[PDB]
Design an enzyme around this catalytic site. Structure first.
Site, PDB file in Angstrom:
ATOM      1  N   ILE A 216       0.811  -1.210   0.000  1.00  0.00           N
ATOM      2  CA  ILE A 216       0.000   0.000   0.000  1.00  0.00           C
ATOM      3  C   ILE A 216       0.851   1.271   0.000  1.00  0.00           C
ATOM      4  CG2 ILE A 216      -1.825  -1.218   1.206  1.00  0.00           C
ATOM      5  CD1 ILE A 216      -1.170   0.355   3.786  1.00  0.00           C
ATOM      6  N   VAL A 217       0.219   2.389  -0.341  1.00  0.00           N
ATOM      7  CA  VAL A 217       0.895   3.677  -0.366  1.00  0.00           C
ATOM      8  C   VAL A 217       0.163   4.597   0.591  1.00  0.00           C
ATOM      9  CG1 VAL A 217       1.746   5.560  -1.634  1.00  0.00           C
ATOM     10  CG2 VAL A 217       1.152   3.489  -2.861  1.00  0.00           C
TER      11      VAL A 217
ATOM     12  N   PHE B 227       6.489  12.980  -2.445  1.00  0.00           N
ATOM     13  CA  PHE B 227       5.086  12.951  -2.793  1.00  0.00           C
ATOM     14  C   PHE B 227       4.907  13.773  -4.066  1.00  0.00           C
ATOM     15  CE2 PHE B 227       0.724  14.946  -2.112  1.00  0.00           C
ATOM     16  CZ  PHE B 227       0.031  13.823  -2.547  1.00  0.00           C
TER      17      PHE B 227
ATOM     18  N   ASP C  34      10.053  -1.880 -16.420  1.00  0.00           N
ATOM     19  CA  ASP C  34       8.615  -1.788 -16.183  1.00  0.00           C
ATOM     20  C   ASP C  34       8.052  -0.434 -16.601  1.00  0.00           C
ATOM     21  OD1 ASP C  34       6.146  -2.876 -15.536  1.00  0.00           O
ATOM     22  OD2 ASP C  34       6.243  -2.363 -13.413  1.00  0.00           O
TER      23      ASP C  34
HETATM   24  C1  LIG Z   1       1.581   1.850  -9.781  1.00  0.00           C
HETATM   25  N1  LIG Z   1       2.483   2.508  -8.822  1.00  0.00           N
HETATM   26  C2  LIG Z   1       2.529   3.988  -8.976  1.00  0.00           C
HETATM   27  C3  LIG Z   1       3.596   4.565  -8.052  1.00  0.00           C
HETATM   28  N2  LIG Z   1       3.276   4.215  -6.641  1.00  0.00           N
HETATM   29  C4  LIG Z   1       4.292   4.907  -5.814  1.00  0.00           C
HETATM   30  O1  LIG Z   1       5.302   4.298  -5.444  1.00  0.00           O
HETATM   31  N3  LIG Z   1       4.087   6.192  -5.460  1.00  0.00           N
HETATM   32  C5  LIG Z   1       2.851   6.979  -5.799  1.00  0.00           C
HETATM   33  C6  LIG Z   1       3.188   8.342  -5.328  1.00  0.00           C
HETATM   34  C7  LIG Z   1       4.441   8.329  -4.773  1.00  0.00           C
HETATM   35  N4  LIG Z   1       4.871   9.542  -4.412  1.00  0.00           N
HETATM   36  N5  LIG Z   1       3.830  10.426  -4.722  1.00  0.00           N
HETATM   37  C8  LIG Z   1       2.819   9.716  -5.267  1.00  0.00           C
HETATM   38  N6  LIG Z   1       1.537  10.286  -5.765  1.00  0.00           N
HETATM   39  C9  LIG Z   1       0.479   9.515  -6.049  1.00  0.00           C
HETATM   40  O2  LIG Z   1       0.520   8.299  -5.901  1.00  0.00           O
HETATM   41  C10 LIG Z   1      -0.716  10.219  -6.522  1.00  0.00           C
HETATM   42  C11 LIG Z   1      -0.848  11.629  -6.314  1.00  0.00           C
HETATM   43  C12 LIG Z   1      -2.004  12.326  -6.784  1.00  0.00           C
HETATM   44  C13 LIG Z   1      -3.034  11.606  -7.452  1.00  0.00           C
HETATM   45  C14 LIG Z   1      -2.916  10.186  -7.644  1.00  0.00           C
HETATM   46  O3  LIG Z   1      -3.853   9.346  -8.384  1.00  0.00           O
HETATM   47  C15 LIG Z   1      -5.292   9.502  -8.417  1.00  0.00           C
HETATM   48  C16 LIG Z   1      -5.891   9.233  -9.688  1.00  0.00           C
HETATM   49  C17 LIG Z   1      -7.311   9.216  -9.817  1.00  0.00           C
HETATM   50  C18 LIG Z   1      -8.120   9.490  -8.671  1.00  0.00           C
HETATM   51  C19 LIG Z   1      -7.538   9.787  -7.402  1.00  0.00           C
HETATM   52  C20 LIG Z   1      -6.120   9.799  -7.276  1.00  0.00           C
HETATM   53  C21 LIG Z   1      -1.759   9.496  -7.168  1.00  0.00           C
HETATM   54  C22 LIG Z   1       5.112   6.974  -4.701  1.00  0.00           C
HETATM   55  C23 LIG Z   1       5.304   6.465  -3.254  1.00  0.00           C
HETATM   56  C24 LIG Z   1       6.483   7.080  -5.405  1.00  0.00           C
HETATM   57  C25 LIG Z   1       3.254   2.750  -6.492  1.00  0.00           C
HETATM   58  C26 LIG Z   1       3.156   2.355  -4.989  1.00  0.00           C
HETATM   59  C27 LIG Z   1       3.313   0.923  -4.652  1.00  0.00           C
HETATM   60  C28 LIG Z   1       4.068   0.015  -5.467  1.00  0.00           C
HETATM   61  C29 LIG Z   1       4.298  -1.322  -5.023  1.00  0.00           C
HETATM   62  C30 LIG Z   1       3.757  -1.750  -3.770  1.00  0.00           C
HETATM   63  C31 LIG Z   1       2.983  -0.857  -2.959  1.00  0.00           C
HETATM   64  C32 LIG Z   1       2.755   0.482  -3.409  1.00  0.00           C
HETATM   65  C33 LIG Z   1       2.135   2.166  -7.426  1.00  0.00           C
END
Ligand SMILES: CN1CCN(C(=O)N2Cc3c(n[nH]c3NC(=O)c3cccc(Oc4ccccc4)c3)C2(C)C)[C@@H](Cc2ccccc2)C1
Length: 292
Positions: free
Chosen positions: A36-37, A99, A142
């Site tokens: 989860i995130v 973030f 990926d």
């Molecule tokens: C498929 N991957 C995308 C990247 N994720 C990440 O690793 N994120 C997401 C992320 C981060 N920093 N800031 C954001 N911002 C949003 O996620 C972020 C910000 C704003 C909007 C948003 O979408 C939305 C879109 C539509 C509706 C509502 C929200 C997302 C990090 C921690 C780098 C992965 C997590 C993961 C990987 C493996 C195991 C567990 C968790 C999943």
């Protein structure tokens, strides 16, 4: 590598201590391929960060997780999401990262049509990252819209290095079947020794996502799509006539079945198509919070 050797190895490369010592108000915002995130706040500054909590008992290839933390921990590039710290908490790996307010490219390609200036900007950002990464022997493996995140002001960053590998003069190729079905390179699906070129093919698929809204064979089961990708001629764009000759030329250099003939990140950076790239401000309108 057993579970305990995995946890121990992990404990060896992660930061010591508990992030609960300086992180507050954790709030789940989503999840990924194996965890989860959440968003949290750094006590001393009040700075908001994102925390990726991964279930160590759900890791298919736990060797890859180890590679991600070791290789990318101190990585610093303007088009690459930054990792601040990592911690081993019980049976979970916690990775504190920046973030990014703009979200992932997936939400954009599936709800709106980008213009060529926005596409070129995305391709340029990803290619700048890959050119530096590939030169260092690092392959992402990926590449896809989901792996691309955006800052509030429109900057593009490559994330999700969970499947990354390292190559060198001594070990110039990999043979592991990794990545996401629809985006996998044909030589990789064939299980042939491959190199950084696989990222270029995946990028080409992501370009199809930006133009069509989805990758080829997305209407087929993953294993079936993989077979088609490996055996059929390169994929085609549904909205073919809606794109310019420059974008088509660009794309033709990405979706080359024979990796030896496929363009490299460095070569692609000098392609006329990227000259159309708009500034970060052109990406802002695409974000869900700003779309109409
Ligand atoms: C498929 N991957 C995308 C990247 N994720 C990440 O690793 N994120 C997401 C992320 C981060 N920093 N800031 C954001 N911002 C949003 O996620 C972020 C910000 C704003 C909007 C948003 O979408 C939305 C879109 C539509 C509706 C509502 C929200 C997302 C990090 C921690 C780098 C992965 C997590 C993961 C990987 C493996 C195991 C567990 C968790 C999943």
């Amino acid at each position: 590598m057993s579970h305990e050797q995995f946890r121990a190895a992990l404990q060896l490369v992660v930061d010591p201590g508990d992030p609960r010592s300086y992180l507050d108000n954790f709030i789940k915002i989503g999840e990924g391929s194996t965890g989860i995130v959440c968003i949290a706040t750094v006590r001393s500054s009040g700075k908001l960060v994102a925390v990726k909590k991964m279930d160590l008992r759900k890791q298919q290839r736990r060797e890859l997780l180890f590679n991600e933390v070791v290789i990318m921990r101190d990585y610093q590039h303007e088009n690459v999401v930054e990792m601040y710290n990592s911690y081993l908490v019980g049976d979970e790996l916690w990775v504190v990262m920046e973030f990014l307010e703009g979200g992932a490219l997936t939400d954009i390609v599936t709800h709106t049509r980008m213009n060529e200036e926005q596409i070129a900007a995305v391709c340029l950002a990803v290619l700048q990252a890959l050119s530096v990464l590939h030169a260092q022997g690092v392959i992402h493996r990926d590449i896809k819209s989901d792996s691309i995140l955006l800052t509030h002001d429109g900057r593009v960053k490559l994330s999700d290095f969970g499947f990354c590998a390292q190559v060198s003069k001594e070990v110039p190729r990999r043979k592991s079947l990794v990545g996401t079905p629809y985006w996998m390179a044909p030589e990789l699906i064939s299980r042939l020794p491959y190199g950084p070129e696989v990222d270029i093919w995946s990028l080409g698929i992501m370009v199809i996502e930006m133009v069509d809204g989805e990758p080829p064979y997305f209407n087929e089961p993953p294993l079936k799509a993989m077979k088609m990708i490996r055996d059929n001629l390169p994929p085609r764009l549904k909205n073919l006539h809606k794109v310019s000759p420059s974008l088509k030329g660009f794309l033709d250099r990405l979706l080359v079945r024979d990796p030896a003939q496929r363009a490299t990140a460095a070569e692609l950076l000098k392609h006329p198509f990227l000259a159309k790239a708009g500034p970060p401000a052109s990406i802002v309108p695409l974000m869900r919070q700003n779309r109409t």
